[PDB]
């Protein structure tokens, strides 16, 4: 939230002196948790062969 009085960010109801940015690791990279989580971002498993 921003204080309307002064254009100043409030964190947990109390002001911050400065320009607040949300911290992130390099380029917003996030560690892969699981095979299942990696697979959940992929296409579904391929359909069976036509033999």
């Amino acid at each position: 939230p921003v204080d309307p009085t002064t254009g100043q960010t409030l964190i947990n109801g109390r002001p911050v002196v400065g320009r607040v940015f949300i911290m992130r690791k390099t380029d917003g990279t996030v560690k892969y948790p699981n095979v299942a989580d990696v697979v959940a971002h992929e296409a579904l498993a391929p359909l069976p062969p036509v033999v």
């Binding site: 690791k25 390099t26 996030v30 560690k31």
Partner: protein, 273 residues
Amino acid sequence: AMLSFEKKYRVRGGTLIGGDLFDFWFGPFYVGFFGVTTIFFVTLGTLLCVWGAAMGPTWNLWQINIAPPDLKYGLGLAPLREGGLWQIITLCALGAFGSWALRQAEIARKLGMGMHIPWAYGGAILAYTTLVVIRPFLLGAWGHGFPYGIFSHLDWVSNVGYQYLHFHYNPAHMIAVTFFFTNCLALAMHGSLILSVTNPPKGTPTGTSEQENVFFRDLLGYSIGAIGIHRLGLFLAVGAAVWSAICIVISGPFWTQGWPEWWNWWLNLPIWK
């Protein structure tokens, strides 16, 4: 602590730079001026690697990844969190490896040895310098260097290879591979032979250069001899690194197509076009 025979060898002299100023040991290690510059660059580079790990997503050793900048930064230094750190670490690496080779030269001069070891190591430094300096310079951006990370640099190797569709068809790469494989074969034979004459079956007398020579000659048909096998091992191991440097510097700067279609010149020789 010193080897039982070592003390009489610990003389002054043989330095390239600095003279007596750093001409001393620390435990087993010889220091010297290039020892001091080695520790400086090693320390600065290693701590900047730890800083790269700290601002990245994980402390997992395998997954740490300090990446070069985007290609858009060209030959400039990028912002430090956007690949400029990789550039500073690369300067430390070049300083550390160069200091190591010159320190090896000072040690060899102090022992009255030939300069073979520093120059053999120069082959490896040439390959590293090709990968991060020469090839990226010829392509016009430092972002062509490989990232510093135990597995992320293997992702770079994979993707660079497939930039040429079928990197096995690179002709200098075939030579480089042949040197690496031939080196490993030759190393197994040299190790085996020396051990098998010096450690014969129980109750057998210690072998001789003649037995080694006879056996080797039944393996290859010819005698290589004692100095010959060490020349060969040096030729093979260093030639492998030199042909590696060639195979990567021609990929991109000089050849841009798939590597299989380079072989079109062989198909069109006039005797059989």
